[PDB]
Amino acid sequence: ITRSIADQARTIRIPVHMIETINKLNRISRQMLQEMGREPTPEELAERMLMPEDKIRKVLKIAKEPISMETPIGDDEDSHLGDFIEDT
């Protein structure tokens, strides 16, 4: 059961380490918060990890749902999320 939901979980394919890299930076964020009491700035963790600081920000942009289309916005009658995007 940990093999099937290990890849084909979301509606779209998702890598393995891409979801294992999130909780990796989690069990350390509160680790420095329970001691010092301040938010771990992207400077001290840049020396303990293999990620610089710039490219690591674009990684979070990938980790999403992202979002459906047939979802009410304002009119809640005929207006849909995928009905406001112009065509090229």
Partner DNA sequence: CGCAATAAATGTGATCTAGATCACATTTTAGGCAAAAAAGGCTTTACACTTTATGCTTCCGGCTCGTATAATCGCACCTTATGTGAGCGGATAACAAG
Part of the chain binding DNA (CB under 7 A), chosen from 16-24, 28-36, 41-49, 69-77: 16-24
Tokens of 80: 């849909």
3 binds DNA (CB under 7 A): yes
Part of the chain binding DNA (CB under 7 A), chosen from 11-19, 28-36, 39-47, 75-83: 11-19
- Select from 27, 55, 61, 64 the one that contacts DNA (CB under 7 A): 55
Considering the complex, state which of residue 32 and residue 42 has its C-beta at the smaller distance from DNA. Answer: 42
b or e along 2-26 (b: 16 or more beta carbons within 10 Å of the residue's beta carbon)? eeeeeeeeeeeeeeeeeeebeeeee
Kindly state the DSSP code that residue 10 receives in the 8-state scheme: S
